[PDB]
Design a protein around this ligand. Structure first.
Ligand SMILES: [Zn+2]
Ligand SMILES: [Zn+2]
Ligand SMILES: [Zn+2]
Lengths: 131, 171, 56, 55, 47, 48, 222, 226
């Protein structure tokens, strides 16, 4: 729920301590009190039902956008753009090849977002970041 | 954790040691009750540095016992644990409740509830150990453990360790 | 807990106050003295401290 | 009839402590009589209020 | 609320209600126990 | 507010407010609540 | 476009007025969303091309995207003479906060510059354009000659007057904070009644704002 | 009438039906229906005994569900008794309910935190607890069992953490059960509450019977300086 945190079942009204502690691995409405209870002992699975990905407490952050899909798209864009940082001067002013590079990086960002070709694009990213 | 500190200790010299060379009896008795001694305030005191010059104050005769109380001030290396610190060590004993890892002069007990669930006890194997799908924790095996709680009495220090956090366990 | 009139509550708390007072000081001016089964006054802590037979 | 209407949370009934005999019947204008589990109810009896000036 | 209210008529508790939309308007007093009902004809009122 | 005259009758204190005197027993819980509200600078001036 | 809209929604959640240049907004958007100025300069064109190629029968659901494309294209191309204002309260009278984001054009000479550049001869004329030297400073254009005519009248065709005080010599003003004062409203009402009594055919009354007129007419009727 | 009054009446009816027994519900519904009630009127309506209403009035006064007024009047026969008037202080009552539920959920969170602490140990002979910190200082030379300080008996393991999720389940099984309460207080916090008193409650009472011994007219006095 946008107002209530189902892991502790606390409304924002009578329990104002709930916050937007999101996970880069799997974005969820877990509050800080639930984070400090479950994951202070160590890493565990996702407390939400229907999801069991292993997550760490130190990787937690706050969401800056209202939409979860936009937030994960922007975070994937950050995770790709860190090594993919070719500019116009990197292409020596080649405008067309810069557009092709931008299309390629947007396509691999889209593929990482929707997971249609996650393995091959992840291998391509891992080979590119070594260079 | 290893530190170097300046410590002051009250030593009660018996009147039988009131000789011309009383200072060397005081220094020798200083070592025997400090070297390897465990104090909960300052941790396990290991070695006494600056032995050539040790600040020995003028001792006060106790008004009913006759022994002389000196306030000996010395610089010594100590080992004081803390919660939330990561230390390496070797396992010296194992049981169904857990295994004891030897870090410095101290034995940290790692409880059974504070390990990954893949580890389970096996008393049939000699020596008894904990076996997992990726590693084993046996006697005289290197393991990195995070101390999450230490209890310090007046003369003993016991610490509780965990290996549930990532980048811990065997090295 | 079980409900009582305010006179009964005040009476019970006055009894508790008197018992605590005579436990700490049995010789109070203008007050009844707590007595034993034999009729002798209860030796309070103040009686145990004062006098030539006290702790001091 | 009163026993069946009591458990349906339609009426409020006054019964003796010695036996469950209906004597006086009211109307249950509120919610269900068994909405809260018993184990929470005693927890509601574990808290109190300081005074009339703080709150 | 302005047209309805508790009252004591002839040492008997009851409710006074206004029947204004009907012509002539009426003041109906009804006892809480339902013992009697008293109404007022509002046309022939002087003081 | 007008502070009542306080006098002792045994193990309890009774206060009589000034008539424009109405006498009532001051409960020990009321005195405890009022003593809880005394500021640190206040009872330090009183020697506490 | 979706992440641009979400960044705008993030920026609207503010508790105080933020006045920022378009360059600062672009830098913050790049550092928070990785959106550059150059894709923003083509936002409206790309949106129009996408809507054309989609061949959508309904465009009413996409009317709000036109405002986003307009904001994206305006704030990217223009960075000098423009200012972005974010206010937590659109109207201070409302209890619930209603945020509003205003991208306004501070330099009025920007829009009229291509008019003077394209056309050599421009004849600015109004019935009551005064002073004539304010406009060539306000809008960047040079006048070859500026002059104001005075009508030659056999008799004084119109009679202006300035009324500084009421009938009871109380000074009158239409300041917004003193609209609820009795005496100024008494003077205005008596003035309007007397002028209606002495005017033959018709009469028009002008007010500084719509809210001022609403208040004064409602309490005049009161 | 006033919708906010209906909301606070339903809130007061809900909290007594859940955490209190049937007689408490009868008393609070009597006060909510007839806004001004005395002891004799409450006994006449409920057919309740003086000793029966004792614990009920004590519990609703301890939670500030019922406020009491100590006004005495002058009947014509001059045989006046100091009748107590039971009424409700609506802002005080809703503040008390809010404070009680906030303390209950805080206590439940604290109990969840205490159960999240490791199991520890307990000695079945001397019935004493021992934490996991002090268990290690009591282990034997064989490094196999933890021995008691007094009994010198092997400690058995407690269940601090095995039922912890159950407490969370209890937490869940509270929250939906407290869901109509929190939803009611949303409209309460978003609206204005008029602070009622004995004089205000006399504007909305319902007459319990025709011949009432308790007089509802307030009698002011001169000289009282409380
Ligand atoms: Zn939570
Ligand atoms: Zn998940
Ligand atoms: Zn024992």
């Amino acid at each position: 729920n946008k107002d209530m945190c189902p892991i502790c079942k606390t409304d924002r009204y009578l329990s104002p301590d709930v916050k937007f502690l999101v996970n880069p691995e799997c974005y969820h409405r877990i509050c800080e009190s639930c984070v400090d209870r479950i994951f202070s002992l160590g890493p565990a699975q996702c407390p939400y039902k229907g999801c069991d990905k292993i997550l760490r407490k130190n990787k937690f952050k706050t969401q800056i956008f209202d939409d979860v899909e936009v937030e994960k798209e922007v975070d994937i864009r950050k995770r790709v753009f860190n090594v993919f940082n070719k500019t116009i001067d990197d292409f020596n002013g080649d405008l067309v090849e810069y557009n092709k590079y931008l299309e390629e990086v947007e396509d691999i960002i889209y593929k990482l977002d929707h997971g249609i070709d996650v393995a091959k694009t992840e291998e391509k990213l891992r080979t590119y970041e070594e260079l | 954790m290893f530190f170097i500190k300046d410590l002051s200790l009250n030593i009660t010299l018996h009147p039988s040691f009131f000789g011309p060379r009383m200072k060397q009896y005081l220094k020798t008795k200083l070592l025997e009750e400090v070297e390897g001694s465990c104090t909960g305030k300052f941790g396990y005191i290991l070695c006494v540095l600056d032995y050539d010059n040790i600040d020995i104050q003028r001792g006060r005769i106790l008004p009913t016992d006759g022994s002389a109380e000196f306030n000996v001030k010395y610089r010594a290396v100590v080992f004081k644990p803390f919660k939330g610190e990561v230390v390496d060590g070797t396992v010296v004993s194992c049981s169904q409740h857990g295994f004891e890892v030897q870090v410095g002069p101290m034995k940290v007990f790692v409880t059974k509830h504070l390990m990954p669930q893949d580890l389970t006890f096996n008393a049939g194997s000699n020596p008894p150990s904990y076996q997992s799908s990726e590693d084993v924790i046996t006697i005289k095996s290197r393991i990195r453990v995070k101390i999450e709680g230490c209890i310090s009495q007046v003369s003993s220090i016991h610490a509780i360790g965990s290996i549930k956090e990532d980048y811990l366990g065997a090295i | 807990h079980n409900g009582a009139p305010h006179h009964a509550i005040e009476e019970a708390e006055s009894l508790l106050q008197f018992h605590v007072a005579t436990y700490m000081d049995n010789d109070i001016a203008g007050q009844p003295q707590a007595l034993q089964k034999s009729g002798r006054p209860v030796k309070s802590i103040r009686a145990r401290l004062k006098g030539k037979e006290g702790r001091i | 009839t009163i026993n069946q209407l009591e458990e349906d949370s339609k009426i409020l009934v006054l019964r003796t402590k010695k036996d469950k005999t209906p004597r006086y019947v009211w109307y249950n204008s509120g919610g269900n009589l068994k909405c809260i589990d018993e184990e929470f109810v005693k927890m509601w009896e574990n808290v109190q209020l300081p005074q009339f000036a703080e709150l | 609320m302005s047209h309805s209210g508790a009252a004591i008529f002839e040492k008997v508790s009851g409710i006074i209600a206004i029947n204004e939309d009907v012509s002539p308007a009426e003041l109906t007093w009804r006892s809480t126990d339902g013992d009697k009902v008293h109404t007022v004809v509002l046309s022939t009122i002087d003081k | 507010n007008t502070q009542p005259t306080i006098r002792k009758d045994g193990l309890k204190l009774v206060g009589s407010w000034k008539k424009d005197p109405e006498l009532r027993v001051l409960s020990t819980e009321e005195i405890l609540n009022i003593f809880k509200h005394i500021s640190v600078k206040d009872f330090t001036s009183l020697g506490f | 476009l979706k992440r641009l809209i979400e960044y705008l929604k993030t920026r609207m959640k503010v508790l105080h007025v933020i006045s920022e240049t378009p360059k600062s907004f672009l830098q913050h958007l790049k550092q928070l969303t990785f959106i550059e100025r150059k894709p923003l300069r083509f936002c409206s064109e790309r949106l129009s091309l996408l809507v054309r190629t989609l061949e959508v029968t309904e465009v009413e659901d996409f009317t709000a995207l036109k405002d986003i494309a307009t904001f994206a294209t305006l704030i990217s191309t223009y960075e000098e003479g423009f200012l972005l204002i974010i206010e937590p309260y659109e109207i201070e009278n409302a209890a619930v906060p209603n945020p509003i984001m205003r991208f306004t054009c501070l330099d009025a000479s920007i829009a009229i510059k291509p008019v003077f550049e394209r056309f050599s001869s421009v004849i600015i004329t109004s019935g009551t354009i005064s002073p004539l030297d304010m406009y060539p400073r306000m809008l960047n254009f040079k006048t070859v000659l500026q002059k104001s005519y005075a009508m030659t009248l056999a008799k004084k065709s119109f009679l202006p007057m300035i009324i500084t005080k009421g009938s009871d010599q109380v000074a009158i003003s239409s300041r917004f904070e003193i609209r609820n004062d009795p005496s100024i409203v008494r003077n205005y009402g008596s003035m309007l009644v007397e002028f209606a009594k002495i005017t033959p055919d018709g009469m028009v009354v002008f007010f500084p704002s719509y809210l001022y007129m609403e208040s004064i007419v409602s309490m005049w009727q009161t | 009438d006033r919708p906010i009054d209906d909301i606070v009446k339903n809130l007061l009816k809900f909290v007594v039906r859940g955490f209190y027994g049937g007689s408490f519900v009868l008393v609070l519904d009597a006060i909510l229906f007839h806004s001004v009630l005395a002891e004799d009127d409450l006994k006449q309506l409920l057919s309740i005994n003086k000793t029966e209403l004792g614990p009920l009035i004590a519990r609703l006064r301890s939670d500030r569900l019922i406020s009491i007024h100590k006004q005495r009047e002058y009947p014509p026969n001059s045989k006046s008794v100091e009748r107590v008037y039971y009424y409700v202080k609506y802002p005080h009552a809703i503040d008390a309910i809010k404070w009680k539920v906030h303390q209950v959920v805080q206590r439940l969170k604290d109990d969840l935190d205490k159960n999240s602490e490791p199991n520890g140990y307990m000695c079945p002979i001397c019935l004493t607890k021992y934490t996991q910190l002090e268990a290690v200082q009591l282990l034997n030379f064989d490094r196999t069992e933890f021995l008691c300080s007094l009994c010198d008996e092997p400690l058995v393991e407690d269940d601090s953490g095995k039922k912890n999720k159950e407490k969370q389940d209890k937490l869940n099984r509270l929250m939906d059960q407290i869901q109509p309460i929190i939803d009611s207080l949303k409209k309460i916090d978003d609206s204005r509450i008029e602070e009622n008193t004995f004089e205000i409650a006399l504007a909305r009472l319902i007459p319990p019977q025709n011949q009432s011994h308790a007089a509802y007219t307030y009698n002011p006095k001169k000289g009282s300086t409380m």
